[PDB]
């Protein structure tokens, strides 16, 4: 009941994700090292992690079917507003409900200049998302749907974005119906869209604490140019 186009879309997103997510963490070595001893001691490392992750999210976004049809401006607006959300999403793959250096916990994030106001709901998110035990097919569709959202502020051709997203949305809904067996499939789509809603709230809180954090020039100094451009300066 999955059309050939929908199977095409899944194959494309799977490969796109495989080409942008290295589970071996080979590149983490090139980041400024994590410091655990420590005010904002993890900021340099996590900033590089996030900067790296933005690059990977962009590479993924470009391979989303239809994304190349949007204008340069709309591509920018979608990536700027969704970046942190897709990084939180993709990070679920490394999250465990149970390396050692690149295994991050609450205190690490706290040492990057954030409070429990963000960290608590972020952990709730990760646990709740993990619980869904999504197929990888569903995981990559959710990231793409997150990126191509009509309602992002600054979108010009919202009708086009929405049309590109509906195609991705219909592919997910059909995949679940045809490929994800119950009970695991029970209301799975609704629960995935709720995760996207959770992500909007996580996005807003991160934005707040990022403004506070990056207000001090001595902390802004510890960020990267890409982070400053995408998250703001």
């Amino acid at each position: 009941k999955l059309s050939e186009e929908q199977q095409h879309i899944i194959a494309i997103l799977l490969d796109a994700h495989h080409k942008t997510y290295d589970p071996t963490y080979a590149d983490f070595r090139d980041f400024r090292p994590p410091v655990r001893m420590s005010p904002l001691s993890m900021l340099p490392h996590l900033a590089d992690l996030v900067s790296y992750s933005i690059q990977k999210v962009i590479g993924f976004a470009k391979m989303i079917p239809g994304f190349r049809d949007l204008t340069s401006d709309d591509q920018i607006v979608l990536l700027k507003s969704s970046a942190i959300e897709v990084i939180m999403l993709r990070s679920n793959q490394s999250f465990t409900m149970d390396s050692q250096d690149y295994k991050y916990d609450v205190t690490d994030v706290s040492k990057a200049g954030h409070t429990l106001e963000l960290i608590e709901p972020l952990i709730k998110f990760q646990v709740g998302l993990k619980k869904l035990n999504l197929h990888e097919e569903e995981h990559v569709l959710l990231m793409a749907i997150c990126i191509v959202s009509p309602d992002r502020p600054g979108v010009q051709d919202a009708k086009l974005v929405e049309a590109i997203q509906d195609r991705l949305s219909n592919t997910l809904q059909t995949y679940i119906r045809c490929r994800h067996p119950p009970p695991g499939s029970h209301q799975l789509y609704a629960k995935m869209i709720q995760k996207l809603a959770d992500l909007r709230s996580l996005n807003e809180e991160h934005s707040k604490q990022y403004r506070s954090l990056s207000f001090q020039p001595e902390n802004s100094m510890k960020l990267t140019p890409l982070v400053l451009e995408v998250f703001g300066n």
Binding site: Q55, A61, K62, S72, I76, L79, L226, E229
Partner: peptide, 11 residues
Amino acid sequence: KNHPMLMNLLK
């Protein structure tokens, strides 16, 4: 603002 780096990475 302008986003040269983001612009460049999006091709």
